[model samples]
Target chain A: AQKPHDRMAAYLESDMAAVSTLIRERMASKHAPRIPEVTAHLVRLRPMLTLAAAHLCGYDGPFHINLAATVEFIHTATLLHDDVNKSSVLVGDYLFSRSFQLMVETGSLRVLDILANASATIAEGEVLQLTASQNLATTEEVYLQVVRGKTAALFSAATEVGGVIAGAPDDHVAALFEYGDALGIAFQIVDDLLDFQGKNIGDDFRERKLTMPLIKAVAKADAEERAFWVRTIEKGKQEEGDLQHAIALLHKHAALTDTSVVARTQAARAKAALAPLPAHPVKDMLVDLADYVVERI
Target chain B: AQKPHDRMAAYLESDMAAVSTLIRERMASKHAPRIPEVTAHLVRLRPMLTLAAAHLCGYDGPFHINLAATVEFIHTATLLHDDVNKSSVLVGDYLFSRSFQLMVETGSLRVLDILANASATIAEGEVLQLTASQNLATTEEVYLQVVRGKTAALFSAATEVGGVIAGAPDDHVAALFEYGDALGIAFQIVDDLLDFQGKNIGDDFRERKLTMPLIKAVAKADAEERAFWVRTIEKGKQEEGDLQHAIALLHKHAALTDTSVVARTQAARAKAALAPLPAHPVKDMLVDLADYVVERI
Candidate 1:
């Protein structure tokens, strides 16, 4: 397998070239010169695509390039709608506006349309996850399904499109999707765990979010403690310092350890999904990427 | 031509049946039955689709059904994200939340995604229109260009998709888009005109908006009145009862009539675009719809 950093750097360099070329093409139109935001966001993806593509599918030329751009487009489109939706008070935050602006400026309405559609699905998945938690319907199995729709859909699309752009076979495309699905599930599980630990988890709790760790912990905890956890996380009518008590309860039940185990197992499954691919440097990097996702957990 | 009410009733009946059938067919899923918001939104469309499809497309036929459902889906998806983004308080005052909840219950992520992507494009078009106003960078010609993206895109999509579903030919499909584009421009122009007249013509001046009528008035008015108008609308810092003054200024400059003329021209153009379409009761209904859009002006 090629060195991860080297592959990533090379991918970034190529992506930079592609984006620069596209930008020049887009800017040559004299009709509207305000296409700068679009140009800038497309350029910004060089680093993310480089890293993600390297780890997920290895630095395999234009295949990863298309996947990366598609992912970037999907993410940016969300930000555009999100800003409008959020009425986000960050116009100076050109990063937010530039994403959707570029899609429009580039006259890629069809592509933007596809990305927007994908994002709505992601949001629906998120809402489903939210509803699941509120109703106490978040079994590990159901939780995994939500994760697949929310996170893995994008991740899988990224890799699956990469394979399609690379002219990979049908089975290879499916394998890429499987790889993304497993890795994405693991990644979200770890994020859920981090949120439970009160480590910059942000408004998830305030929004009454229930990640895998907290849900598992509540399900397995003693009756009294479970009721308290449910009221705090699920109902969200907690008093001051109730959060600290919640963390202590998680530790008491060893839910964190079990959650980590679940994450690790998923990571392993992610790597296993890639076994169908021919032994290539990208394949090894993908395996390592899955491990990296669970490393924090 | 068919009587509007009779045509509308038939249109509503058939379209409602189509919507009910599609909702059941598309959303018969077993996963996460707990999340009912998807179905909830899909159900609300039965009534809305009936109304819009009848009103906008004369309750035509199969194509009308598709167009109506597609439009409703787009509108509903926007409210979902809009409510989430705004953290909007749902009260008896607005129907946005109730409609959003219904979409969730249907578990129609795929439908929601398709509509959202379309909405993103429509929104981008709206943004372009807003940014293009008052800035020397945008001309009257450029304003129309932006408006097409914003207003016409949705109308075009609604009609084009309808025709496609009904197996309309390429030329008819193109005519649907052209008709939509013209109708949309006229609709927006009328809306702009309304802000200058009506019991509330000059209200936008209070909010400092640069609606089309005002923009035209600024161009036609003398130097001093033009300066006052620009200061109010462009700067968005209007004082109390400034609306009456703004309306008076519009009349003094004869801008309202000119604005009405512009809207009529667009409405006529919209009707003209249908000249090449095959003779049909539905086609004639579309022409009336286009004219009705600008009738208030």
Candidate 2:
């Protein structure tokens, strides 16, 4: 009845609970109670991947709880940094310092490098995406680059560090990194697909974001379709009924289907990357997780 | 004619130069070149302090260079986080990750903990300061708390970690942290005094900041004086000639004088904390540096 992630969550409930406790304790500040307020309104999928990845690598040490919490702190800090004006910035920095403290506890340069590199790339991706926000000239190549930074880098680092901490074979660590990277790309594309699929009903469109669907649709658009995009996305003069029309245009150009294919390819790539990984239940769950992302679209 | 800080900068020119070069190389991004652009607009006093502290601890090793660069990156990232919107957040995160990477290079858990604690405290201070903005009931104790976090923590960490990296005795490290903390408190109070002294011409008041001078003035105000503060600072109904009147009120109540005394006390405390520190030329310069902050007032 539950999804792969949900199932994974259930299986790792104890460890995840430890992670939750770690986050709650570390994120609390006596000077500013509002910190935990903002931190409380967050999810744990990235850290779950970290937990599952460590399990898949057969790491049963006490350190995995700290690693999972570290990953989640990084993810949460990234989200807070992306969210508000000044308060969030401060709170975000607090979370980053907490994450930094956790990483320091691990005593692994390899693990530190993986997460540090991921954090840098995540920032780089956001800067590029800011540049591409309303521009119609964005290429799929650039889009992938942005996604790699914004999403996949963390995912890749999450799993790779998991394997690294467990002293997995080099090849296995490499495979784990590849799996997380591919899974992240698939997960992000799936997110983009869902955005256009009416969970928020053209939320990205209102913000004039040129996600994968619009990019693909814009690339194949006709004279009229092109101008429609130009007005709605580029110029930001969105009107009523524009959401329906955007959806229609997306369908007309088969952009939605093409985007699905792209996501599916990444999902397959992710599952395939796990081939060299040891056969573990968590590995199977990760494989199912990859397919589940694409299956949602 | 040069100030104490500039004198320190001159003495540590070569090492500071490496910090500059290290920052220039590491802050660059192939994907988003704007990172370096923002980085280039920054100053180097904090890094200079880091270099000076390292030398005071008799650390001539390669780790000092990395440690100084790491401190600068953390300082720069903190500034960026406190400066702009989304792009700055991303860039700030990049610098933090760079700092994290640099920290990992040092292989000193002590150093990592110092910087990470400072960073977390800095965020906490910012959040508390945010809450205290426009609040008339803020005690000088709370003001000191905010100043410690926003400014003193990094300064303390910068000097303390220098001692840490050099494997200074615990007593020496304690003195190093005390010296930095006292110097930072003096520096921030001096900054507050100078703001009201018209270098920026009451910029803090215009922003409605309750700096030391104003807090002192406000605590001692009469009914009419309290009403003036309420209208101008509390309600933000500032108009023409308000700044001049503010300066007059500050002088009338000896608010500026009181603030200067506070800063001088801190400066003296800072200098005294270094009494147990080993006698080095950098030690004397730090003593002068402490005096110079109060002298500026």
Query: lDDT tens string, model 1, B43-129?
Result: 542233223423433333443444455465544444443243322211100122222233333333432333334444554544454
Task: List residue ranges in candidate 2 displaced over 4 A.
Answer: A1-6, A41-43, A221-231, A237-249, B1-7, B222-224, B239-249
lDDT of 2 by residue, B1-297 (tens): 257667787899899887778888988887865566677777465676777787888887888888889888887777877775676778778888888888878878788878878888888888888878788888898899999988999989988988888888999898989988998999999999888774477899988888988988888889998999999888999989999898999998899988888899988998999998769999988888887767765
Candidate 2 local accuracy as lDDT? 0.84
The top-ranked prediction according to DockQ is 2
Residue B283 accuracy (lDDT) in model 1: 60
Decoy 2 TM-score against native: 0.92
RMSD of each: 6.9, 2.6
| lDDT, candidate 1, A1-297, per-residue tens | 236545544645656567555434432323344445554554442224323444444435443433354456445533443344232212112222233344333232333443344444565564565457565556777777778766776776566555554556678767876777777788888888887653375345555666776677677777787688668766768788776776776788787888889889889988888887778655765676777677665
Q: Per-prediction TM-score of chain B?
A: 0.70, 0.94
Off by over 4 Å in 1: A1-64, A79-120, A132-137, A164-170, A195-208, A234-244, B1-13, B20-68, B75-121, B132-139, B161-174, B199-203, B221-224
